[PDB]
Design a binder for this molecule. Structure first.
Ligand SMILES: *[C@@H]1O[C@H](CO)[C@@H](O)[C@H](O)[C@H]1NC(C)=O
Lengths: 22, 50, 64
């Protein structure tokens, strides 16, 4: 079920992934 | 599509402007069963299936 | 009894309209009232009972 779709060492890439209230 | 095997378009994550469909005189009927036809713009749903 | 039934009918009409969030529900309830009103005046017990049973189911759907 494709209910959602969206399209937009030398380096450090930091990310935070959190899931709150959907 | 046919009634037996119809088309189901999933619409979501967009602005569901119903004021055009409601006001349009091209329709022979426009009737709602659970939600008033004039409040459709204010009620924000998770999904609409066409 | 036909008069008791008529009173039940109008109680159901009031409540059915009270909980009639949409317009289609109100329209159906009013139609049911009109049919019952005519049946009552013409002493048609079966039509009056039919409307009452239909109103009960309609209201149950609105409440549950
Ligand atoms: C879509 O969701 C339904 C459950 O409502 C499921 O039965 C069906 O297999 C899913 N279809 C796809 C392609 O994942």
């Amino acid at each position: 079920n494709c209910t959602f779709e969206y399209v937009s060492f030398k380096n450090l890439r930091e990310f935070v992934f959190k899931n709150i209230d959907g | 599509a046919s009634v037996y095997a119809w088309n189901r378009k999933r619409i979501s994550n967009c602005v569901a402007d119903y004021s055009v469909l409601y006001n349009s005189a091209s329709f022979s009927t426009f009737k709602c069963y659970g939600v008033s036809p004039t409040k459709l713009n204010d009620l924000c749903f998770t999904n609409v299936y066409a | 009894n036909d008069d008791e039934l008529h009173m039940l009918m109008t109680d159901l009409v009031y409540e059915a309209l009270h909980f009639a969030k949409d317009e289609e529900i109100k329209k159906r309830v009013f139609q049911l009232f009109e049919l019952a009103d005519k049946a009552y005046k013409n002493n048609d017990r079966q039509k009056l009972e039919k409307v009452v049973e239909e109103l009960k189911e309609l209201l149950e759907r609105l409440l549950s």
